[PDB]
Design a protein around this ligand. Structure first.
Ligand code: NA
Ligand code: NA
Ligand code: NA
Ligand code: NA
Ligand code: NA
Ligand code: NA
Length: 327
DNA sequence: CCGACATCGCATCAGC
DNA sequence: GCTGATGCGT
DNA sequence: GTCGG
């Protein structure tokens, strides 16, 4: 992990441009183009001396190379400086930090004069359920979660799930499963022997129980297979109350469980790489299954998977411990 | 030059 | 009432 | 915005 002081000015620049493309210009692909350029440069173990040097990295093109040259020569970007001072654009960009408020809602709000969290408060009836919760926990949702709190959160989830039905299988994935010292949220993958690709209250009972012991505090969305909400650890005697945290609970069919555990454990860089390796081996891996590719390139039928190991075996790859899946 | 860039559950809008 | 499209986070 | 058919 190269020092950020190496090319941090550049990575921050690209990241900022990324947000404006996504939130203001509504160009998701340019958003990702910038992110990809920011990521490949954040990994470059050398201080970039010119745009041409960066141009050699995959993801960096002529336009970004030109912007780097300007930033290296002036310590800033004219277009960025200008958009930063634009009241409309800066307001739209900012509002998207509220969970539930995307580019469209942000633009809609700003057009009608609603530009700050204060404006949002005075106009609660103009917000949907999700957005109201995002506003209520604006601060908490941007805070990170120390691993110690994740362990405590896991303790509660695993205990309550087993209490509902000892046959449930629950796995907390995400970077937490890879040993991360902090997490941005909690992702729980749930399954049950009675639930398979071929045969609906399993998820509900679990959410209900977590609400019963006051762990889950709010609901953003809830269907038969996916729950997205808010949780909070119990407060310690006469001590500071814990921040509210984002938690997702997915119910997955037994036969697709381990592909799910693999996919949601990542990391993204690892998933991308494992998918790559899978392909050159005649296999395609998504969050649901692993399928063999046949001559023409069409994916056949899902292969039986009884664990993460099975997936690794198919692609003739040694099982990799989650801690070693940073890439 | 120009199409791909991930997919899809859930909440809610658009429209019959 | 419904189906399908869109927004959002994923 | 970048890559690549
Ligand atoms: Na390049
Ligand atoms: Na948002
Ligand atoms: Na956001
Ligand atoms: Na039991
Ligand atoms: Na999906
Ligand atoms: Na329709």
């Amino acid at each position: 992990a190269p020092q950020e002081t190496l090319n941090g000015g550049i990575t921050d620049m690209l990241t900022e441009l990324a947000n404006f493309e996504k939130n203001v210009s509504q160009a998701i692909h340019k958003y990702n183009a910038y992110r990809k350029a920011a990521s490949v440069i954040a990994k470059y173990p050398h201080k970039i001396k010119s745009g041409a040097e960066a141009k050699k990295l995959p993801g960096v093109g002529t336009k970004i190379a030109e912007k780097i040259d300007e930033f290296l020569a002036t310590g800033k970007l004219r277009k960025l400086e200008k958009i930063r001072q634009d009241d409309t654009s800066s307001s739209i960009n900012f509002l998207t930090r509220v969970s539930g408020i995307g580019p469209s809602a942000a633009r809609k709000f700003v057009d009608e004069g609603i530009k700050t969290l204060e404006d949002l408060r005075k106009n609660e009836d103009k917000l949907n359920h999700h957005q109201r919760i995002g506003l209520k926990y604006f601060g908490d949702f941007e805070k990170r979660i120390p691993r110690e709190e994740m362990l405590q959160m896991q303790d509660i989830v695993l205990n309550e799930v087993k209490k509902v039905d000892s046959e449930y299988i629950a796995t907390v994935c995400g970077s937490f499963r890879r040993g991360a010292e902090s997490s941005g949220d909690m992702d729980v993958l749930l399954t049950h022997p009675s639930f398979t690709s071929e045969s609906p209250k399993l998820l509900h009972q679990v959410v209900e129980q977590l609400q019963k012991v006051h762990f889950i505090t709010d609901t953003l969305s809830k269907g038969e297979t996916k729950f997205m909400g808010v949780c909070q650890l119990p407060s310690k005697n006469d001590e500071k109350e814990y921040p509210h945290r984002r938690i997702d609970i997915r119910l997955i069919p037994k036969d697709q469980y381990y592909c799910g555990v693999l996919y949601f454990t990542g990391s993204d860089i690892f998933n991308k790489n494992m998918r790559a390796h899978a392909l050159e081996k005649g296999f395609t891996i998504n969050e649901y299954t692993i399928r063999p590719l046949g001559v023409t390139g069409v994916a056949g039928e899902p292969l039986p998977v009884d664990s993460e190991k099975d997936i690794f075996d198919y692609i003739q790859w040694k099982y990799r411990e989650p801690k070693d899946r940073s890439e």
